[PDB]
């Protein structure tokens, strides 16, 4: 069995290897990459997402989100307070202001320390979940707006045509901007490209141990857990690496830098934070291997984790017994 310790693996595809997306995902899994829940892909030196990022300042962040924390330094939840609209230009200036800027630090390790020590005492503002793409239409390899659709993957595997579209999202980040512990909708894969700016630090639990994370979460957020059997789908719970280590939870960490892709694999729980002003682009995708995961994915039916009309079909075809209840929650 490849990668039995579930280490995060880093790949350096050649330009020829970067042509066929599906084939390279499959190659990665042949080397056991999926066991980690997350892989880093460094593009060939010949490749670029687009020519420059000089002209992105007029992009609108219609609903910037202030991430307000509650709890203790290593075990907290965050809620999203909507803020007034701003452009990327305005957001970048805000991120660089004294109130929000990255503090002086020696290295990524020092900064991670500072993050977990102090995150809860601030409320950074995240330009999250903006429909759009920064890939040039002429970029033919690993263009997140031109991947096979999940709806076509389902159709090809299972024979049924369904409604729905899958498009990418942009994330404009600043220091302490946080993504909570989660797997993707329907335990899909995701791909994340860091277009510009400061790093993004990731934590990931191997898919084979996801239930260990879930158990700890029910213990650490007892009220949330009573409220919903799949509350991690709300995407509000943070648990620090120190707490995971204290509780014997298997996990790994890595820092993503501008120009690098991260792929998360089905049922790979992940969380993390931004080091400073940055922009990432992300989308979900599927492969034939995902279908079994999709069939078994736990659903939030409590009303909190409202999602896109896109998931309807996935639940309806893959999880017919759960569909009615899940629908009531939507």
Query: Which residue's C-beta sits nearest to Ni ion?
Result: 190
Site string for ligand 5V3, 283-302 (x = CB under 6 A): xx------------------
Tell me whether residue 234 is annotated as binding.
Answer: yes
Query: Which residue's C-beta sits nearest to ligand 5V3?
Result: 282
Tell me whether residue 184 is annotated as binding.
Answer: yes
Q: What SS3 string covers the chain?
A: CCCCCCCCEEECCCCCCCCCHHHHHHHHHHCCHHHHCEEEECCCCCCCCCCCCCCCCCCEECCCEEEEEEEECCEEEEEEEECCCEEHHHHHHHHHCCCCCCCCCCCHHHHHHHHHHHHHHCCCEEEEEEECCCCCCCCCCCCCCCCCCHHHHHHHHHCCCCCCCCCCEEEEECCCCEEEEECCHHHCEEEEEEEEECCEEEEEECHHHHHHHHHHHHHHCHHHHHHCCCHHHHCCEEECHHHHHHCCCCCEEEEECCCCEEEECCCCEEEEEECCCEEEEEEEECCCCHHHHHHHCCCCCCCCCCCCCHHHHHHHHHCHHHHHHHHHHC
* Residue number with CB closer to ligand 5V3 (67 or 224): 67
Site string for Ni ion, 176-195 (x = CB under 5 A): --------------x-----
User: Could you tell me which stretch among 16-24, 279-287, 289-297, 320-328 binds ligand 5V3 (CB under 6 A)?
Assistant: 279-287
* Residue number with CB closer to ligand 5V3 (1 or 177): 177
Tell me whether residue 200 is annotated as binding.
Answer: yes
CB of 113 to ligand 5V3, least distance (A): 20
Q: Which residues are annotated as a binding site?
A: 126, 182, 184, 192, 200, 228, 234-235, 270, 300, 302
Contacts with ligand 5V3 by CB under 6 A lie at 128, 169, 171, 179, 184, 190, 192, 200, 270, 280, 282-284
Q: Which residues are annotated as a binding site for 2-oxoglutarate?
A: 126, 192, 200, 235
């Amino acid at each position: 069995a490849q990668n039995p310790n579930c280490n995060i693996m880093i790949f350096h595809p050649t330009k020829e290897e970067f042509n066929d997306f599906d084939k390279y995902i499959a190659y990665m899994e042949s080397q056991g990459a999926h066991r980690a829940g997350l892989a880093k892909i460094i593009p060939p030196k010949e490749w670029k997402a687009r020519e420059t990022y000089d002209n992105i300042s007029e992009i609108l962040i219609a609903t910037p989100l202030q991430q307000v924390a509650s709890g203790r330094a290593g075990v907290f939840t965050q809620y999203h307070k909507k803020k007034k609209a701003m452009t990327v230009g305005e957001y970048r200036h805000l991120a660089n202001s004294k109130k929000y800027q990255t503090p002086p630090h020696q290295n990524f390790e020092d900064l991670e320390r500072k993050y977990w020590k102090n995150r809860i005492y601030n409320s950074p503002i995240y330009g999250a979940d903006i429909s759009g793409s920064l890939f040039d239409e002429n970029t033919k390899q690993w263009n997140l707006g031109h991947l096979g659709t999940i709806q076509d993957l389902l159709e090809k595997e299972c024979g049924v045509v369904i409604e729905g579209v899958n498009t990418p999202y942009l994330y404009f980040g600043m220091w302490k901007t946080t993504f909570a512990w989660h797997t993707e909708d329907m335990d899909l894969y995701s791909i994340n490209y860091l277009h510009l700016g400061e790093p993004k630090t990731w934590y990931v639990v191997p898919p084979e141990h996801g239930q260990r994370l879930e158990r700890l979460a029910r213990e650490l957020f007892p009220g949330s857990s009573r409220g919903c059997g799949a509350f991690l789908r709300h995407k509000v719970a943070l648990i620090s690496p120190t707490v995971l280590k204290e509780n014997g939870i298997p996990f790994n960490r890595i820092t993503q830098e501008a120009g690098e892709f991260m792929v998360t694999f089905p049922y790979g729980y992940h969380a993390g934070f931004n080091h400073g002003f940055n922009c990432a682009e992300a989308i979900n995708f599927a492969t034939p291997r995902w279908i079994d995961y999709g069939k078994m994915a736990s659903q939030c039916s409590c009303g909190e984790a409202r999602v896109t009309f896109s998931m309807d079909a996935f639940v309806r075809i893959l999880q017919p017994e759960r569909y009615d209840l899940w629908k009531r929650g939507q």
